[PDB]
């Protein structure tokens, strides 16, 4: 029917939009990790000198719980770059007020880094570089404190949000419908803003009957995560607050500097 | 304020 045409429209208009926006997909990220890929298989980094020897096929651009922190920031400011990139593909997205367009972009990146992580994650570790990396849970909780605690909430998400098994069709309209938040602190125009979202809801709904309909209310459990996201979010704004506090040997990239400033 | 956000969303 014509109501449900329209919502298929949009849920194909954005799965376009992210496999151009995002070079690594989660159809591609599962088959790197399941040896599936006839593909190079991913350089494995479980300790210190897997480390040192895995700078070949990863990019840095002193202490090495310092240099990882760093690269996460690195694969933070790409991702933001990304993100912003699908936000303008979302139909109406460039239409509202540019200042609502920052501060939308300024409270979705984190949450939506953290959804699209979880694609790269198993209970064991998660790709990096565009999965050409394999960094250990392990490794990552082995570095000292504060950095030893900065990765695990991330895998205790993703290990819980990737058993409802969404597909990047569905995942795109997840991203569109968290970037379309009408409760972001300092919005001036909700209601632009909740009519898209309202929108982009009724076609993530139709997406979780059609493209799942041996599931049921797939939907129902997805909305429920869009709080445990913030929660990551909070959570990991605080622990950056820890991290600059205590260390002076390092600054943050500005961009995450302009999104964390007057954030939580 | 956001001027590297903007710049992103402006490009």
Known sequence: ?264 | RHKILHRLLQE
């Open chain 1, 1 to 264: 029917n014509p109501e449900s045409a329209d919502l298929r429209a949009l849920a194909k208009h954005l799965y376009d939009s992210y496999i151009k926006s995002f070079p690594l997909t989660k159809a591609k990220a599962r088959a790197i990790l399941t040896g599936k890929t006839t593909d190079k298989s991913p350089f494995v980094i479980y300790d210190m000198n897997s480390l040192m020897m895995g700078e070949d096929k990863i990019k840095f651009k002193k202490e090495v719980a310092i240099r990882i922190f760093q690269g996460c920031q690195f694969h933070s400011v790409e991702a933001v770059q990304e993100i912003t990139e699908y936000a303008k593909s979302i139909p109406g997205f460039v239409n509202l007020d540019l200042n609502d367009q920052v501060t939308l972009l300024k409270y979705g990146v984190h949450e939506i880094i953290y959804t699209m992580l979880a694609s790269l994650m198993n209970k064991d570790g998660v790709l990096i570089s565009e999965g050409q990396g394999f960094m250990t849970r392990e490794f990552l909780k082995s570095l000292r404190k504060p950095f030893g605690d900065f990765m695990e909430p991330k895998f205790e998400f993703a290990v819980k949000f990737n058993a409802l098994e969404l597909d990047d069709s569905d995942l795109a309209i997840f991203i569109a419908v968290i970037i379309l938040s009408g409760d972001r602190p300092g919005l001036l125009n909700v209601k632009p803003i909740e009519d898209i979202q309202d929108n982009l809801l009724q076609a993530l709904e139709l997406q979780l009957k059609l493209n799942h309909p041996e599931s049921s209310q797939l939907f129902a459990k997805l909305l429920q995560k869009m709080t445990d996201l913030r929660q990551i979010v909070t959570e990991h704004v605080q622990l950056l607050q820890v991290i600059k506090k205590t260390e002076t040997d390092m600054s943050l990239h500005p961009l995450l500097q302009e999104i964390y400033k007057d954030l939580y």
